[PDB]
Each structure stands twice: as C-alpha cells, then as structure tokens.
Amino acid sequence: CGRVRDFVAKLANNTHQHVFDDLRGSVSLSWVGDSTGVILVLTTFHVGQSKLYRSEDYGKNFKDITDLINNTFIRTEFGMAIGPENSGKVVLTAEVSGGSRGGRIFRSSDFAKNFVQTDLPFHPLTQMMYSPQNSDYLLALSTENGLWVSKNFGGKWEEIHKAVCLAKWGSDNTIFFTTYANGSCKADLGALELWRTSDLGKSFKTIGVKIYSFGLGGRFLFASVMADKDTTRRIHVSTDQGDTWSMAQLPSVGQEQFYSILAANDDMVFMHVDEPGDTGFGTIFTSDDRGIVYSKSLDRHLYTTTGGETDFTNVTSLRGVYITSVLSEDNSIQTMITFDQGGRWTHLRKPENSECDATAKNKNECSLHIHASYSISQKLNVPMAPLSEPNAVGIVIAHGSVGDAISVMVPDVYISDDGGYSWTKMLEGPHYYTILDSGGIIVAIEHSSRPINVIKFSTDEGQCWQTYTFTRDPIYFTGLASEPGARSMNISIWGFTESTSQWVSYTIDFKDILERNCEEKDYTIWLAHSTDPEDYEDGCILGYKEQFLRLRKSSMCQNGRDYVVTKQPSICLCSLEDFLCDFGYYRPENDSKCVEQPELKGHDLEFCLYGREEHLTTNGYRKIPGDKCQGGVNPVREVKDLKKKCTSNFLSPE
Ligand SMILES: *[C@@H]1O[C@H](CO)[C@@H](O[C@@H]2O[C@H](CO)[C@@H](O[C@@H]3O[C@H](CO[C@H]4O[C@H](CO)[C@@H](O)[C@H](O)[C@@H]4O)[C@@H](O)[C@H](O)[C@@H]3O)[C@H](O)[C@H]2NC(C)=O)[C@H](O)[C@H]1NC(C)=O
Ligand SMILES: *[C@@H]1O[C@H](CO)[C@@H](O[C@@H]2O[C@H](CO)[C@@H](O[C@@H]3O[C@H](CO)[C@@H](O)[C@H](O)[C@@H]3O)[C@H](O)[C@H]2NC(C)=O)[C@H](O)[C@H]1NC(C)=O
Ligand SMILES: Cc1cc(=O)oc2c(CN[C@@H](CC(C)C)C(=O)O)c(O)ccc12
C-alpha cells in the first residue's frame, strides 16, 4: 500500500528514555495544564516513602522533586488533586501521626515548582474539590462529616455545616450538599436534607427534603426523593438550582434499584433505570430539554449492580453517536449503536472482509460487537476500552468481535473513520492505542504476556502501519501516557525491565515524522452521517447536516496544536421525526404521528396525578432536544389540559 520513508532516523534522535530508579506501590501520573508539558509522577512504598517526579518536556525527562515535600509520606487514596485548566493548582495529602489534631496538605499554585505545607483544622474524608469557576476555592469533607471550605487555595479553612453526606460544586461557586440530623448518613438515607449556598457558607437554603441522593449533569440538578411512608423513590429535576422542582416522567424504584445519568449535555440526559429484581440490566430513557419528559430509548441495557459496569459510550468523534451493550433473551451480550441520540438503535455493521465466528448462527450474516468496561471487568483479554476524540472527526477504535454476540476469544482491534457506520479490522490481536495530532497519527502497542521493544504508527488513520523499535532492552509494557486532548506529537511508553525490577519510560516525539504542516489542499470535503447521497435529506441528524474538512488519508502532515475542526451546518426542514411525543401521547404503529393515550397507566398515571401545570398541559409534541430543524412541519393544535383526564376516573370531594 504505502508507508513513510527513512522514518527510523527520524525517530532515533526523538526517542527519549528516562529511568525511574526507586519506584514501588501505587504509581499515579498527572498531567498539569494544557500546553504546559508538566507531568507529575507520585509513587508510594510500604513496609513507607513517597517519591515525586516532574517533567516539563511531556515525559522526555523528569527530575526528582521529593525534596520539595520534605520527603514525607503522601496518602494515595487522595492522589494528586489537580486544579482546573491552566490554573496550575496541585494538592497532595500527607499522612499524619495518629494523634494529630488535623490533616496536612502540600500545595502548589505554580505547577509544582514550589510547594507549601499547610496543617488543616480537620482530617479529610475526601479529595479536595476545586470550584470550576475559581481555582482558589476548595471544599472538603472531614472524617467528622463536616463540610470545610477554603477561599484561598487551601490556606485557611472554615467549617460551613457540621453534618454532610455529599457535597458538590455547581456553576458560579455554588455549593450543593446533603445533610443529616439524627445519626449516620447511612441511617438517615432517604431522610436527608438537600441544601444550597451561593455565598460560600454565609447563608443556606434547604432546597430539598426526604432526600436519598443527588447529582448534576448538563443544566440539570437531579435529586432522588423517597415516597412518604414508603420504601421507594423517584427523580425530581431542577434547572433553577433548587429554587423550583418538578417530578420526572420516570418510574419509581425500590431500594435494590438505582438510577444513573449515563450522559448529560446542555440539551438532555440519558437516564438508566435499574430493573426490579437483580437483573443486571435496565432501560435507558432520553429526556426532553427540561429533563422532565422521558422517551424510552433502550431495553435490557446491561448495567451491573455491584461494581457497576456499563458499556455505555459516547462516541465523541461524531455528533449523535452512542454505542452500548444489551442483554439478549438467550442471555448473551450484543452491542448496539444509535446515530440519532437514542431515537433508534441498531446492530453495528460488520467489516466487509470479516468472517463470522462461532457465536454467529449464519457464517455469512452477523455483526460487530464491542469490548468495553463490561468485557474488561469479566477479565477477557482487553487492554483498552473504546477510544475516540472530538478533534479527530469520525474516528473510533475498539477491541471487538464479529458474530451474534460478544465472544470470549482474544479480540483483534477494529477501527472506523466514519463514526461507526462502517468498520475495518485495524490490527490483529489486542493492542493499547492512542491518537495524536487530531488523528494525524495513530499509535499502537501490542498487548503481550512477554516483553516488547516495538511501537506501531499510522499517518493514514489506520489503513497502513509501520513499525519502530524504540529500545534495545525490551520492557514489560505498563501503559501509555499522552497529553489529554489528542493534540500533541508526544507519546510516553511506560514499562519495566526484566529483573531487581525498575520502571522506565520511553517518550517519542513525532515532530520529524510529519515535518510538513498541513495546508488547505490537504483537507477534503466530507459530509457526516451520509447514507444515500441522492437524498435531499441525506445526513440530516437532529434536524441538520454537517460538512467537514477532514485530513486526507494520503496526505501526511501535522494538523497542529492550534488545529480547528471546520464544519458547516445545513438546516433541514422539520418533519414529524424531529419531534418526540409529549406527556400522555404515544406513537402507535408505523405512523410517526403522536396520538393521545386512551388512558395513562403506571408512572404515567403517577405523574398525571402528581405532576404540575406546565407539563400536564401539552401540545402532544415537543422538538427533540438539540434538534435544530427549521420550517416544514410544526404541529398545529391547541395545548390541552390533561389533569382532568387522569382525575376523570376518581370520585372527588366537594
Ligand atoms: C457526547 O460527546 C460529545 C463530544 O464531546 C459532546 O459534545 C460536546 O458537548 C459539550 C457540552 O454540551 C460542548 O461543550 C462546549 O463548551 C464550551 C465551553 O464554554 C462554556 O459554555 C457554557 C457557557 O455558555 C458553560 O457550560 C461554561 O461556562 C463553558 O466554559 C462552549 O462554549 C461550547 O459552545 C460548547 O457548549 C461541546 O462543544 C460538544 N462537542 C462537540 C464536538 O460538539 C456531547 O454533549 C456528549 N453527549 C452528552 C449527552 O453528554
Ligand atoms: C512535544 O514535546 C515538546 C517538549 O519536549 C514540546 O515542546 C514545546 O514546544 C512548544 C511549541 O512547539 C514551545 O512553546 C513556546 O510557546 C511560547 C508561547 O508563544 C513561546 O515562548 C514560544 O513560541 C515556544 O514555542 C515550548 O516552549 C516547548 N517546550 C519544550 C520544553 O521544548 C512540544 O510542544 C510537543 N509537541 C506537541 C505537538 O505538543
Ligand atoms: C452502579 C450504581 C448502583 C446504585 O445503587 O446507584 C447508582 C447511582 C445512584 N443514583 C441515585 C440518583 C441520583 C444520583 C441522581 C439513586 O439511585 O437514587 C448512580 O448515580 C450511579 C451508579 C449507581
């Protein structure tokens, strides 16, 4: 096919070895800041000692800064707490003598050039959490279940409430937290009170009662609330930060049951609801843009209750695309993909040249299935979960199998450049994989029981590969590290030599491999979501199309750190398919027409009794959240009031 020439020399001077000498136990790695190059490596020993290393070169060289922490012992439970973005804030938690009045931290605002020791008034139960708004604002939970806040980068701490189960930063330095009264968080479960502070503890407002748990995603604030004189509970939603609430359109659940936010974005959430009775699976619902009304997206979605693992995956390299696992009747697992944000799920098309396996009832006809958290947890030979990056358009890389179900065999690696519509076997056998330069470079390391001296790369998005021996002394591979955001040319291969064992890291700079900077000609026009190009609506997803400029497979050049994914939207005519049925409406049959329910049952009937004025009254149709369509069809009909229809059956008092 095609390759890069004289590459060996180009990677020769760019391969940078660093040996880590003393290392043991927990090894944490933290990137600090974007486009800084700062990496922290924290190690701990036990009968012990903590070693701390720093690199400004993206891992090409480190320097032992343990002398900055006074060679004291860092507790790994709390790891390295890194400030948001380029703040440079770094906080480590030291272990203190048993009798100490309070804990102790080592903090740096300088990207760990200098640290300062600070004795705390308390003992941290949790890692310290930075306010996303202001990186000098931190909150922590004490072992006494106190809520402590620092206005200056952990220098001074104030205890704002004395009983707290859970606490979170919202937007604008807001703090949400749950509290208890009588006794342990555990005991008062369901009886918890939900509070909010917007002043950092000057004043509070209790925005919920009978609270079980809460959580944030997108614009939504979710709270689980227990039913009066009952063992069950249900979701309530707030977009006003607790000021007003509304009951969700979801079913209630018992105590063995749970809710989970699978994904949330400014438009909506995917809510997973556990099935009653230890199924190991649930149903996924997608919400409307209020987070109030829930369409039912997927049945028998696999989510384990203990050590809860779900293969649910945002495919971040193309808009609207998500993959996940479902549990079949034959008790086997199948991967499904949605291109529309959960309006439709379907099996993943299999590679043209792939062959079906034993799991498949027909040798000619089967599909592609993806290994993800679940496979991993069951200890199938799976080095990495699925990878995609938003700056690498359409690209998805995953271990998988081709057949009627996820198979237990040793998986090859598969790739897609179109966002999951079509696939190809990228490499045979399990590999660790990473994306550099927004897809300009793909890198892979073989997964082996025995040591490896070799790395593999592709500049054509996985179509052909080349091989580079980065060391004479082969190592046992322990991981890849590369700058978050997939924009660098720099990749770190982590491992240890055969023993007297020690860790080493070989960091490779591809700057010479692609010497040429990409230019306008190197990009070609690509419509995302194309199915039938003769169709006027081809590629409309959620009301609109996007056309991209993508880097040619053939063209090899660096995209650049400043690279901008450029795309243009086309606004499609609204059709009924752009709407979801509103409360008390459903799509019977083939027709996409939303029609009125004859009567509301189950949680529909629950809501209908217990809902509120806005949602109970309806147009029968709402725009799918995030759906940008213009013109064409707007359903025309008058808002009705459904409260009468539910209460219609009940005898009412005077
Ligand atoms: C599945 O993965 C997709 C790819 O990552 C997700 O798409 C991304 O969604 C996020 C959030 O909706 C978008 O984030 C951007 O954030 C910046 C930050 O600016 C500020 O925005 C508001 C202020 O108005 C506030 O939240 C903060 O102050 C932020 O600092 C915005 O300026 C952007 O306009 C945009 O909102 C990404 O743009 C988007 N990526 C792509 C490639 O479209 C998708 O949401 C995921 N699905 C789910 C359900 O989570
Ligand atoms: C691969 O790793 C190397 C480090 O080994 C990274 O080197 C860094 O390169 C950037 C730009 O190429 C340098 O940035 C600087 O930016 C400021 C802002 O204008 C200005 O002083 C200069 O224009 C300068 O270029 C940075 O100093 C440099 N750092 C080191 C230690 O060499 C390189 O960025 C990595 N490659 C990629 C693609 O990320
Ligand atoms: C795996 C798992 C098991 C479980 O029992 O509960 C989970 C929950 C709890 N969800 C809360 C609702 C609230 C947080 C919005 C609730 O169920 O009341 C998760 O959020 C995520 C994962 C689990």
Short mmCIF file of C-alpha atoms and ligand atoms in Angstrom, two decimals, residues 16 35-37 56-61 437 483 487-490 507-511 558 560-561, ligand 2:
data_model
loop_
_atom_site.label_atom_id
_atom_site.label_comp_id
_atom_site.label_asym_id
_atom_site.label_seq_id
_atom_site.Cartn_x
_atom_site.Cartn_y
_atom_site.Cartn_z
CA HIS A 16 13.87 9.80 24.91
CA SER A 35 0.28 23.10 26.52
CA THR A 36 2.45 23.22 29.64
CA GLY A 37 4.09 19.82 29.28
CA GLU A 56 8.23 19.98 31.59
CA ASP A 57 9.03 18.10 28.34
CA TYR A 58 5.93 15.84 28.12
CA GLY A 59 7.79 12.97 29.82
CA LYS A 60 11.09 13.13 27.93
CA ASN A 61 12.91 13.98 31.16
CA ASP A 437 -2.32 15.38 16.39
CA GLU A 483 -1.35 14.90 26.59
CA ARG A 487 -3.19 17.37 20.15
CA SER A 488 0.47 16.55 20.76
CA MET A 489 3.11 14.67 18.77
CA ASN A 490 4.44 13.31 22.07
CA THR A 507 8.88 9.23 25.23
CA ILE A 508 8.70 9.61 21.45
CA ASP A 509 8.39 12.88 19.51
CA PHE A 510 6.90 12.52 16.02
CA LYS A 511 7.73 16.15 15.14
CA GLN A 558 0.87 17.74 11.18
CA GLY A 560 -1.02 21.38 14.59
CA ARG A 561 -1.83 22.22 18.21
C1 LIG B 2 6.45 17.64 22.14
O1 LIG B 2 7.21 17.86 23.33
C2 LIG B 2 7.99 19.06 23.31
C3 LIG B 2 8.82 19.07 24.58
O2 LIG B 2 9.79 18.03 24.57
C4 LIG B 2 7.08 20.28 23.22
O3 LIG B 2 7.96 21.41 23.12
C5 LIG B 2 7.41 22.75 23.28
O4 LIG B 2 7.03 23.29 22.05
C6 LIG B 2 6.24 24.49 22.18
C7 LIG B 2 5.84 24.89 20.78
O5 LIG B 2 6.31 23.94 19.83
C8 LIG B 2 7.02 25.58 22.92
O6 LIG B 2 6.10 26.64 23.17
C9 LIG B 2 6.53 28.02 23.32
O7 LIG B 2 5.37 28.85 23.28
C10 LIG B 2 5.52 30.19 23.77
C11 LIG B 2 4.22 30.97 23.52
O8 LIG B 2 4.34 31.74 22.31
C12 LIG B 2 6.78 30.87 23.15
O9 LIG B 2 7.73 31.16 24.18
C13 LIG B 2 7.45 30.03 22.01
O10 LIG B 2 6.81 30.28 20.75
C14 LIG B 2 7.60 28.50 22.30
O11 LIG B 2 7.50 27.85 21.03
C15 LIG B 2 7.60 25.06 24.23
O12 LIG B 2 8.48 26.03 24.80
C16 LIG B 2 8.34 23.73 24.00
N1 LIG B 2 8.83 23.19 25.26
C17 LIG B 2 9.96 22.48 25.37
C18 LIG B 2 10.30 22.01 26.75
O13 LIG B 2 10.67 22.23 24.40
C19 LIG B 2 6.17 20.16 22.00
O14 LIG B 2 5.15 21.16 22.02
C20 LIG B 2 5.46 18.80 21.94
N2 LIG B 2 4.74 18.69 20.67
C21 LIG B 2 3.41 18.86 20.57
C22 LIG B 2 2.84 18.77 19.19
O15 LIG B 2 2.71 19.06 21.55
#
